[PDB]
């Protein structure tokens, strides 16, 4: 199962670690993609996740996109997960560096209560461009199931261990 995690509450844990290295070790039930409403998995979480998948999520997701339309900022839909997990959850944070509602992090972190055990990362963090310590508060406060979080950045995880309340 998930090692090395650092427990932060009763349902969420936290490791300094590559979401696409930890979900090919893993294979866990879900992986969550730091997705757009296009699904289009260029950079960040999404396209290192896309990348791994040899592009085969991103023609899934064009696919989704032809059949359904967009996503909602805030929503979310449940893919193959490909060689990385049997389901990829793809989850619309507000993406800060386009004037999106922050207050919809909390409605992205909501998806998360759907599944029972998930890998994550921390969501609107990075190039969504939202401060990241309130990620994981938003993260902490809504989600109730088992949350593996993956953080990338070593010295953003030391912050992130350190400053949690
Ligand atoms: N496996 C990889 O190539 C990467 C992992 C990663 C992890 C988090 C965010 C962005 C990333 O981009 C590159």
Do not use: W
Not at 3 to 31: C, F, H, M, Q, R
Not at 55 to 73: F, H, R
Request: charged share 20%; hydrophobic share 40%; proline share 3%.
């Amino acid at each position: 199962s998930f090692s090395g995690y650092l427990k932060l509450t009763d349902n969420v844990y936290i490791k300094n670690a590559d979401i696409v290295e930890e979900a090919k070790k893993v294979k866990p039930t879900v992986v969550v993609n730091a997705a757009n409403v296009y699904l289009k998995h260029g950079g960040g979480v999404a396209g290192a996740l896309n990348k791994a998948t040899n592009n085969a999520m991103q023609v899934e997701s064009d696919d989704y996109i032809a059949t359904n339309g967009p996503l909602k900022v805030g929503g979310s839909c449940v893919l193959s997960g490909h060689n990385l997990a049997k389901h990829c959850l793809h989850v619309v944070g507000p993406n800060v560096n386009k004037g999106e509602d922050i207050q919809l992090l909390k409605s992205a972190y909501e998806n998360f209560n759907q599944h029972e055990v998930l890998l994550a990362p921390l969501l609107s963090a990075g190039i969504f461009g939202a401060d990241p310590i309130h990620s994981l508060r938003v993260c902490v406060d809504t989600v109730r199931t088992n949350v593996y979080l993956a953080v990338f950045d070593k010295n953003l995880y030391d912050k992130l261990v350190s400053s949690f309340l």
